[PDB]
Assembly symmetry: D2
Homo-oligomer: 32 residues x 4
């Protein structure tokens, strides 16, 4: 049924979290 | 400060979500 | 800077995960 | 089967994200 569709939404959310992680690391690292 | 540490926790959470996604796909796919 | 904005995106993601949790529970519970 | 258990793990993850959101807001707000 919907389980595979739900899984793909979770993967998309995981990618958003990774992007936010990298955003935070960049805020920490500044101009270097 | 703590931003890089927070980022790593978010990456760990992202990996948990990916694992759950694959778990759900496996429930859907059964014995094949 | 952007930290409060990032926080609100994380809260929005948390709400998406809660919605998915309830969706999965509903798939499990069927017509009752 | 496992769907309700998976849902509870997703809810726990959502709560971790909310905690991180509030942590980031606190970093932004400082001593006030």
């Amino acid at each position: 049924g919907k389980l595979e569709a739900i899984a793909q939404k979770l993967e998309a959310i995981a990618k958003k979290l990774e992007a936010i992680a990298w955003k935070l690391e960049a805020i920490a690292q500044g101009a270097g």
